[PDB]
């Protein structure tokens, strides 16, 4: 229907399994009539470091630099660097944000971690108070579409890696729920380098097939119980 | 003495509270007679992105870029960029690696996330297969020293943030354990911005005093049960 989608994509290689999942997302959401934007972070050379270069004006305190204080104040004053504000505009307009990435060290690749660190600033994505259920991005949906080297069996409670949900907690709860997103159940595509040609093809189509009905899903309960059990 | 320590430090401001923790660590460990080296990532302008610039000479496939594959071969062929191999040399020589950083989004700042992604490469830190215990940095100790914005009550099992140990999982287990480290208990310094100028001292001293007997310490048991169970 009339919905805007931002895909934040973090993979160096267009011909990759990630590039395929990103392209089927664009193809399918386009086909439905959605408005679609992609931030391809590596192709943008997106800057991941949180530095004093992200504020253009007089610093609230130039003697002792505090990145969170200075960016909050820069956001209010409109003196944040324009690569940050460009991304904030995409996220403000979007109804659903999809993050497409390969799992690196049980988390996102650094370039994507830098997008989170720099774009989700105080005043824009949350305030104090104004976080978790009162976060500023309330009304928006987010979804992580994650690829892994490890197999599904490896990511079970009694597997070596532990359950897949355990690694989702900092991203789903600590970032996305904190900012007020409702979180849709993650898409995890396990061990596509191991899988056969039929199996990889089935994983791509399972994602295209899920996206056909994405606007009918309910969000997960983004609680400790969902992630950890017990 | 005779022990080597690497401190990988990620804060933009020398006068920061992280800055004071790093400086107390260098002072106390140097006083004990340890060999101490610090990687000040922001001062080094350390590159956080995983790209094809991490490999010198020609690529073992310049048509489909695969970071894991390309770096693995580059490592074995002594063809990694010198920023990465400088860090690996420090790590190989170290008996204890201390990471000193503010918590950003229940994780490390992206510049430190980038150190993990680019320095801890296959062949160096682990192999495929090659990990957890067949895991190449076995024998070394690692320690996370984290500062937070949110007070310790927020980080209780029924605080809004959940248990501290929930966010340590990807770093302690999925990164440090995976590579073979024994993980010392994390030094978590809750909420220094909310002062007082006084109790900001009790935290710096407990860290100083804890470093006095650091080599006597018992590693945590780095299991799903420690981070999650009862
Ligand atoms: C620094 C680093 C840290 C990592 N940490 C972890 C970790 O903590 N946990 C973990 O489990 N893994 C980890 N990995 C492994 C990583 O998560 C996997 O390598 C990545 O998820 C696989 O995705 P890809 O897109 O690169 O696969 P690719 O290598 O591109 O794809 C696999 C195959 O799919 C094929 N393909 C592409 N498009 C299609 C299509 N349309 N249809 C059928 N096939 C297609 C490709 O040609 C290729 O042969 C890490 C890797 C690195 C480099
Ligand atoms: C992008 C981003 C994401 C964040 N995500 C989270 C998160 O997920 N969870 C969370 O809990 N928090 C989070 N925070 C907040 C962050 O973790 C804290 O702001 C940070 O940990 C505070 O440490 P600092 O060194 O920067 O404190 P500082 O502000 O530098 O220091 C506190 C005070 O101590 C003073 N000081 C310096 N040296 C000494 C000394 N010797 N003795 C006494 N005082 C001294 C300083 O002058 C300062 O006034 C986030 C922050 C940002 C910017
Ligand atoms: C790197 O390639 C990988 C393939 C499979 C994995 O499976 C569990 C991992 C993990 C767990 C950590 C890691 O760094 N890399 C992995
Ligand atoms: C100074 O800012 C903060 C203080 C306390 C926080 O958590 C208890 C956070 C979190 C979770 C995210 C963030 O971005 N900033 C925080
Ligand atoms: Zn949640
Ligand atoms: Zn472990």
UniProtKB/Swiss-Prot annotation, chains A, B:
Cofactor note text: Binds 1 zinc ion per subunit.
GO molecular function term, any single one: dihydronicotinamide riboside quinone reductase activity
Activation and inhibition: Inhibited by melatonin, resveratrol and 5-hydroxytryptamine.
EC number, UniProt record: 1.10.5.1
Residues modified as Phosphoserine: 79, 196
Enzyme class at the top of the EC tree: oxidoreductase
GO biological process terms on file: quinone catabolic process
Catalytic activity: 1-(beta-D-ribofuranosyl)-1,4-dihydronicotinamide + a quinone + H(+) = beta-nicotinamide D-riboside + a quinol
Binding-site positions, FAD: 11, 17-20, 103-106, 147-150, 155, 193, 200
Needed co-factor(s): Zn(2+); FAD
Principal location: cytoplasm
Keywords: Cytoplasm, FAD, Flavoprotein, Metal-binding, Oxidoreductase, Phosphoprotein, Zinc
Binding site residues for substrate: 126-128
Additional remark text: Uses dihydronicotinamide riboside (NRH) rather than NAD(P)H as an electron donor.
Protein's name according to its UniProt entry: Ribosyldihydronicotinamide dehydrogenase [quinone]
Naturally occurring in which organism (per UniProt): Homo sapiens (Human)
